[PDB]
Design a protein around this nucleic acid. Structure first.
Lengths: 138, 386, 93, 61, 136
RNA sequence: UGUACAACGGGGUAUUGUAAGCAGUAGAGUAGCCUGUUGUUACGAUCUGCUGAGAUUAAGCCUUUGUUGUCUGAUUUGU
RNA sequence: GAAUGUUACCGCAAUAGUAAUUGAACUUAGUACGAGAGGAACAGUUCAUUCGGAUAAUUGGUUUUUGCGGCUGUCUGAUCAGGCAUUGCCGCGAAGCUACCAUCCGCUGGAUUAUGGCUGAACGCCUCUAAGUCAGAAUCCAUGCUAGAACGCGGUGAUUUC
RNA sequence: GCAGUCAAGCGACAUUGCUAUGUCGGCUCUUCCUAUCAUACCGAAGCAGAAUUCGGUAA
RNA sequence: AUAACGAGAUUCCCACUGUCCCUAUCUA
RNA sequence: GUGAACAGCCUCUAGUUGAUAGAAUAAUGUAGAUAAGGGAAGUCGGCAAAAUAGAUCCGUAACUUCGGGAUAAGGAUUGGC
């Protein structure tokens, strides 16, 4: 078994889902669902589509580089399948997932910080410019 | 006239007439050989279809080119909550076929089966078993007489059982009565085992098990009045034929001067009871065990139920049976599970099905995640979170 | 196991997992103590705007938005100018 | 006169599966019944005991 | 299955019916192939014989070196260009449908094959795999 | 007259794709005042941040610790 | 669908129809056979061709979900938000429907045709037949499945004080 | 067929040389027959294997 | 007593397409 | 108004709401469409459908009664500011 990352969205592609394309260049492209496959068939650029992870990574909407992401790699060199190592990896994956979620939440908070001041300023502008409405209200 | 060409007849002639079934419950026709050398056990069970899903299985079929490979395949999920015995029937052989001698009911019955005996239940006084219950007690004799009569003259014993509909997500609230022939020990042993189970419940793992082969018997999907083209697969006329093109053009010869019954006229399609055999059970589930959809090759504590629930069906929440292939009937339909009916010894039956991974992605669309945790990890925090 | 909730184990399975996990724990401790996860931002601050004043301003802004939306809906429903002209108020009683 | 008439579940009351709702005929029949009841009341008959013993309909020009 | 097959054939979608044009994938000099019939197919009323990945078909070269034209020889399809069910659980399809020409014994006319070669064809035909520099 | 039913509402799962409005030392370039040589103030398709935002969600999707409403309308049946 | 004392549930089956079909692949085995060329049985195991019954798990196809976005002419003073262009057009598109264009499944007992026999006279031998009888076909009858006689049948619960 | 040939019976079998004047055809459909092309089961053929010929029931 | 032109008769090539393989879905 | 156009569509002045209708969207039809791979393998026969369609620029063969073929054929562009 192997979950594949969508070429157009990087989303996990579980077995028996989506469509795969093989070109004369002797490489394979996997699409999670028909939407991504149709978008690719139109020669669209994922970096210019807002609903694909490529744009978010390029646009900086989410943490693009982090230390946690270094754990996940294509292990071209296998391991001898030690029983203790299996349990250690099982615990480490959960710990890394929790840490990555915390870091992503922190990054989102840092990106969204300051919206409160803008909202307060907009409310002040709306209140100041509508005296008659307030007078009629009370 | 030999028509210069030979073609197979459209549609099997054995499945006629193609009329609607008289009941949504597909009555079982024949039970297994009923060899009395084995312990008493049930021969069938009642379940409700709960959609389907995909399975990846490490095929160990020797000789095949998929030996030791990983093959993805479809599996159907049927909601099979525990079943409760509510009576027994004693059958006596007669020259005119098997005949029902007498029926004995339990001491008390749940409202689910009492409801099955009324069509205006909310207007009904609910007098289901007012006198029969009174006859059961105060002597312990009237029922015992019926039990002795059954023991004396009966040949095959059938247990009256009904599904716990209230446990299922269906809003039906009505149970389905069915007769299940008792196999195993002598008829006296059969009735003794059934008698001790009055008002009790029977699980599903005691009847079926992993790697077991079962036969699916249920009413197929209804489609109403259908043209011959789809009803029997008749080829379409070229284009714009006079008086229609989607119908069989020639119906018969001058001699005979009548339309032959086998000329495949248009009519009702679907809703016909059908029997399928050689269905291998892939997994037996329990409602009290967490991580029903987990596997030794997955480790994920997730239920078989897809994200957001099934389509047109609720959450399993009970015991369920996983079977490969497709089973007749649509979702949330009563389907009766029956044994293979014969001493199957094919390698497919002997094969051990150890699931590698179970698909629990949402069936509501192009699901990309197996559990909400994966979706949260991928998408991350959203605006609504803060 | 070969699989987990996601990001299959074979991608994480590598020698010396414990050392890298300890390094990640050290990195996390280098941030929790420094206040990187500043989740205690439960109160804002402005140029002397007290809680009552800001709350009143927010409520007034919300009411103004609701009134503007209601007026937009009323104008859209009443106008119907796309088909015919509105009656003259002068002649109406 | 029920040739090729559609089926209705309301026919179970009278057994016959074919039934209809002839609104105009029903209106005329109830008007005639009201006239008959008025005539009976004028005569002095007891309305409670009244029942339609005879009713005849035949084609007109 | 014809001679040269070393195993059972998987059930896959029919991509090339009779008369379908498939590009060549060998250095034999041919450029396109015209399918006239499919070996091992059970003919039925109204049903045009159709091939698939790994199938052996009889075709006549339409374009390329004239020496190979007007003669019919067995050909093996290396690319289908129509989605087919792979047992690994992926609905994969190729960019362009293509085939190669070989004798009934399975020996490849061309010394080498160009471009991707389907797994279900290389596995079933040892000679195709040996003469193919790319698989999948 | 209660794990009772129905209309809404809250969530889960999906579809699409970043809504109105605001601000920008982004914005090919063209104009008033002035006096540059990042002048400023105007027009400016687009782009940037609020904003994976906005909208729909069963008419044959799952759930409902909430709000409102409903629960004696006619006929027939006898060994 | 009336009449079967009423309704309801669970059942038997008189009867009618009937289905599976064919080739390939491993082992047998490069073994018996064969001077060489070449080259098999049986049993066991694995797929596919045609046909039949299901079903949307995955993928393909449809868009009136007019669900979500964009595009042109025109109109509401402008923005927003909207009407018409016979479903305006374009992209995606769930639910629904459906495709060897996608998936699953399609049992095994008796009696027989030709054929091999056993015993055994006719004919003081012989005989496969005259009696009896052992087996032997995709055949016939059965197992199974489809419908259930609306005037075929059985069991069970309730059976209206007012 | 022509012209012979001998001969059990009242002429069988064997035997001698050569030797289109009409309109029906095709797509779908159901059923039936065997005078069996293929599939099941068998016998005889120079069947050593492989391949093949004929014959018997079987639609 | 042969140019152009053609709702004139017939043959062939590119694109094309549900005529077909094999049919399926929608709208009034 | 858009558009070369009284081609096609919307709008103003003016004139109409007249075609029996209520409920459902079964088969089959009438009118209009979409479709994975092949692209005529279907059919008596490319019957029907489809495909290019306006404008700007390059280029345009055989024949010829030199007037035509010709928009031959085949190629590049089309929005907004």
């Amino acid at each position: 078994m192997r979950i594949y990352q969508c070429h157009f969205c990087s989303s996990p592609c579980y077995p028996g889902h989506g469509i795969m394309f093989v070109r004369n260049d002797a490489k394979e492209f996997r699409f999670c669902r028909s939407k991504c496959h149709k978008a690719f068939k139109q020669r669209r650029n994922p970096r210019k589509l807002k609903w694909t992870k490529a744009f978010r990574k390029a646009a900086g909407k989410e943490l693009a580089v982090d230390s946690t992401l270094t754990f996940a790699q294509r292990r071209n060199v296998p391991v001898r399948y030690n029983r203790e190592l299996v349990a250690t990896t099982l615990k480490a994956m959960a710990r890394i997932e929790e840490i990555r979620q915390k870091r992503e939440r922190a990054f989102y908070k840092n990106r969204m910080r300051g919206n409160k001041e803008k909202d307060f300023l907009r409310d002040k502008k709306l209140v100041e410019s509508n005296p008659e409405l307030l007078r009629i209200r009370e | 006239s030999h028509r210069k060409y030979e073609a197979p007849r459209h549609g099997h002639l054995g499945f006629l007439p193609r009329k609607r079934a008289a009941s949504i419950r597909a009555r079982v026709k024949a039970f297994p050989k009923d060899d009395r050398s084995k312990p008493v056990a049930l021969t069938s069970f009642l379940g409700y279809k709960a959609g389907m899903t995909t399975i990846v299985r490490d095929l160990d079929r020797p000789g095949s080119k998929f030996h030791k490979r990983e093959v993805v395949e479809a599996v159907t999920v049927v909601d099979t909550p525990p079943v409760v015995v509510v009576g027994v029937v004693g059958y006596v052989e007669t020259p005119r076929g098997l005949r029902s001698l007498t029926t004995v009911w339990a001491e008390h019955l749940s409202d689910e089966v009492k409801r099955r005996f009324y069509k205006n239940w909310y207007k009904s006084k609910k007098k289901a078993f007012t006198k029969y219950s009174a006859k059961y007690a105060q002597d312990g004799a009237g029922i015992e007489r019926e039990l002795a009569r059954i023991k004396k003259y009966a040949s095959v014993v059938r247990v009256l059982v009904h599904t716990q509909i209230r446990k299922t997500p269906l809003a039906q609230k009505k149970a389905h009565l069915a007769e299940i022939q008792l196999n195993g020990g002598s008829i006296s042993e059969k009735v003794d085992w059934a008698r001790e189970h009055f008002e009790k419940t029977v699980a599903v793992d005691s009847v079926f098990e992993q790697n077991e082969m079962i036969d699916a018997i249920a009413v197929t999907k209804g489609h109403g009045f259908e043209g011959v083209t789809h009803r029997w697969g008749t080829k379409k006329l070229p284009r714009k034929t006079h008086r229609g093109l989607r119908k069989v053009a020639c119906i018969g010869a001058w001699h005979p001067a009548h339309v032959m019954w086998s000329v495949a006229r248009a009519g009702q399609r679907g809703y016909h009871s059908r029997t399928s055999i050689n269905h291998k059970i892939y997994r037996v589930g329990k409602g009290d065990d967490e991580a029903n959809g987990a596997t030794s090759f997955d480790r994920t504590k997730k239920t078989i139920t897809p994200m957001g629930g099934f389509v047109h069906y609720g959450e399993i929440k009970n015991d369920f049976i996983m079977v490969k292939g497709c089973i007749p009937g649509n979702r949330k339909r009563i389907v009766t599970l029956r044994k293979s009916l014969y001493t199957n010894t094919s390698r497919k039956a002997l094969e051990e099905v150890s699931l590698k991974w179970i698909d629990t992605a949402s069936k509501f669309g192009k699901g990309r995640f197996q559990t909400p945790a994966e979706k949260h990890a991928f998408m991350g925090t959203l605006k609504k979170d803060l | 196991p070969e699989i987990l909730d996601g990001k299959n184990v074979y991608d994480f399975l590598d020698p010396e997992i414990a050392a890298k996990l300890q390094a990640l724990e050290e990195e996390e401790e280098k941030l929790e103590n420094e206040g990187f996860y500043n989740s205690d931002d439960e109160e804002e601050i402005y140029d002397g705007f007290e809680a009552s004043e800001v709350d009143d301003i927010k409520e007034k802004a919300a009411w103004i938005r609701n009134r503007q939306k209601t007026m937009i809906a009323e104008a859209r429903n009443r106008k119907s100018l796309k088909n015919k002209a509105i009656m003259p108020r002068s002649k109406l009683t | 006169f029920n040739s090729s008439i559609g089926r209705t579940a309301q026919g179970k009351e009278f057994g016959v599966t074919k039934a209809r709702w002839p609104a105009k005929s029903v209106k005329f029949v109830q008007g005639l019944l009201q006239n008959a009841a008025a005539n009976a009341e004028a005569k002095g008959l007891d309305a409670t005991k009244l029942y339609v013993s005879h009713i005849q309909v035949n084609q007109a020009p | 299955s014809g001679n040269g097959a070393q195993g059972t054939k998987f059930r896959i979608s029919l991509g090339l019916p009779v008369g379908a044009i498939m590009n060549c994938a060998d250095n034999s000099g041919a450029r396109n192939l015209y399918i006239i019939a499919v070996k091992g197919s059970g003919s039925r009323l109204n049903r045009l014989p159709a091939a698939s990945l790994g199938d052996m078909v009889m075709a006549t070269v339409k374009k390329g070196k004239p020496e190979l034209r007007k003669k019919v020889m067995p050909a093996i399809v290396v690319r289908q260009a129509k989605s087919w069910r792979r047992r690994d659980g992926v609905f994969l399809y190729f960019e362009d449908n293509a085939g190669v020409i070989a004798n009934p014994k399975g020996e490849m006319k061309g010394s080498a094959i160009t471009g991707p070669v389907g797994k279900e064809c290389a596995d079933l035909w040892p000679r195709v795999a040996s003469n193919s520099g790319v698989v999948v």
